[PDB]
Design a protein around this ligand. Structure first.
Ligand SMILES: CCCCCCCCS[C@@H]1O[C@H](CO)[C@@H](O)[C@H](O)[C@H]1O
Ligand SMILES: CCCCCCCCS[C@@H]1O[C@H](CO)[C@@H](O)[C@H](O)[C@H]1O
Ligand SMILES: CCCCCCCCS[C@@H]1O[C@H](CO)[C@@H](O)[C@H](O)[C@H]1O
Lengths: 259, 259, 259
């Protein structure tokens, strides 16, 4: 519950109770820090940025500066961060753009290791882990319980569904359906995130999913056609709905499988 | 037109009119900031560094500290940056060395995204874009209108000519002739930067270039011999001169083509 | 021998004579700086960190903050750095954990270039060079005279013996025996670090080592069996002892060779 005297804090910023601010932090006039937020020394918060309860941010992280994108034109956008997040040293996160969704959103209980960059208009859920140097291009969507290995680059508009695991040093240019593990320069699906499914899903449903994907990724009928048929033959099945609707909504297309 | 009171500025530094300096900037005694320069909070400028008109530098960038090279011995070198540049967060740029060209030079209207490192003795032109984490080794030369994708590493003494495009995550160890696109770990030429040529060149000349490269990269006569012959059969043709003289001057050799 | 007035230094920290501290440095209550240490502006030193004589640390480096590892629980660990080290901009080094060796150790005369991250429980020797962006996972052991190229990632528990060279952009998941050169995504041994051996070893011994490895890496008898036999047929030979005992102690296994 201490605010360093050396910290520069705009009188227009809103700092709730219990907030800790380390030495030399720089806080702009559009920042909001909810209860229990802890900023180590030298954190830079600019733009219209909201930082949720109990989130902790380490030294030299930069949040809220304008997107790097050239299309940006001093637009009115926001950066919204959830609760119980851990944001490490040298992270750089920008707010959204008018051409995107006018915001960059991050949920709860996530860990963004050092040197992680989150570009404008990205959406990250909860319980995610982005390792050292992960680089997210613009307009990316990441579901809950997603792990992305260090030094991985995700291209613009890519969508990663819930429970996915992406190996380090990968370059992902396509969407990844729920509970899949990805790896490779031009990343592709190598199987299912068994370890994740085992903690969130029941055995019976895990088997169903394997079967589902095996049928979905058959070569003959296109993925799209198999997905639509899957929704018909199983109008009542949460997993089919979650997986198939994700697939049919894909813009960049779904990543390569193995069959 | 405001200079933060918390900023540390050597009385020997030269700060022109209209310069903006954010909170906690550290400016050494050999720095010069031309008109309209904007430094966000926490920018570090050391050594004999000149920053051109209207250039803007974001938080935690470090410019002017001594090169990492071991051969360096407290030499007298400079870092010269042009006008209208955008230098993002966490960039690190060093001045030259006595063994090199005694300076690191950057032209105008360039964008160096976050975590970009420019080593000693590098030369960057104008209208260039270096994405997140691009790493330039020493003595590199980059022409105008060059785009280098994120997380790409360029090895020492490599030269990239005008209008080239280098895909992200590449490792370039050879020179790249004008208007070529490169990609791959041990990077190679995959074709021409059509999108770039279309905005700078006329259709007729674009066709000529394709033809030129097709003949230059034939397997039998060496690239060098074809280049010399090309200069003979076309003593009067700017494109041939620009492309062939570049090739004949190569030290590390020209990158692999595809034919 | 000057300490910037703007620097924040805990009265509990121990600062020896001749120490230089730049503007805005942040020094916690468990830090110790031995004689001749030079901190540029904005260096952050936290936790129970010791910095040896004459070590120099550049702007925005962060040393001593808690490990990123989730298993960590406000444990009592240390970060110990040796003498004559050069630690560049944006480096991030964490102390050890209770599950590891309760410390992160770095020897003497090393150069850690910019953006280098050293995870909890790592052990680095002396005369080493880690290029831009090298990322070390936890519990890694690096011997003396090791060079690791830029943007290389070393996985947890990997051990690199004395005199090894690791090419840039590699991903190492296995141990590397003394005097070997490694390269590749899933890194493997490509030969010997001749350049290194030539400065530290006599010609006769260099020949012996080549022969040793040629016999060790034969396909039929396992590496382990050949190593044990090598120790028997040469109970008195420092090189055999150094190389073979390293191999037999491997946890993650030894890297792939080429024969
Ligand atoms: C397969 C083709 C993939 C093309 C991907 C293009 C991504 C460009 S986006 C770019 O990403 C940066 C991440 O560092 C952000 O900082 C910028 O603001 C944003 O504009
Ligand atoms: C194919 C072989 C390629 C060899 C390339 C060697 C590059 C070493 S240079 C080195 O690059 C660093 C970039 O981070 C700079 O900081 C250092 O000052 C500079 O000395
Ligand atoms: C072949 C399989 C290799 C698995 C390697 C797993 C490494 C996870 S460790 C992890 O490394 C980070 C480096 O950035 C540190 O910051 C964290 O504290 C530490 O917990």
């Amino acid at each position: 519950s201490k605010i360093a005297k050396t910290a520069i804090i705009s009188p227009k910023a809103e700092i709730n109770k219990g907030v800790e601010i380390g030495e030399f932090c720089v806080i702009g006039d559009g920042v909001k820090l909810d209860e229990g937020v802890k900023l180590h020394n030298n954190v830079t918060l600019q733009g219209h940025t909201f930082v949720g309860k109990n989130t902790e941010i380490f030294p030299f992280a930069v949040l809220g500066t304008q997107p790097q994108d050239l299309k940006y034109k001093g637009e009115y956008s926001e950066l919204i961060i959830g609760e119980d997040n851990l944001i490490r040293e040298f992270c750089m996160i920008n707010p959204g753009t008018e051409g995107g969704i006018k915001k960059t959103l991050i949920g709860d209980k996530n860990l963004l290791m050092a040197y992680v960059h989150v570009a404008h208009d990205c959406v990250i859920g909860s319980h995610c882990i982005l390792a050292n140097g992960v680089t997210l291009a613009g307009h990316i969507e990441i579901g809950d319980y997603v792990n992305i290995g260090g030094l991985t680059a995700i291209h613009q508009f890519v969508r990663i569904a819930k429970g996915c695991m992406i190996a380090g040093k990968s370059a992902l240019g396509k969407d990844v359906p729920p509970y899949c593990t990805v790896e490779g320069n031009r990343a592709f699906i190598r199987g299912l995130n068994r370890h994740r499914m085992r903690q969130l899903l029941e055995s019976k449903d895990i088997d169903f999913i394997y079967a589902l994907y095996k049928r979905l990724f058959r070569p003959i009928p296109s993925l799209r056609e198999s997905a639509k048929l899957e929704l018909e033959e199983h109008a009542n099945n949460p997993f089919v709905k979650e997986i198939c609707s994700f697939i049919l909504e894909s813009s960049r297309g779904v990543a390569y499988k193995s069959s």
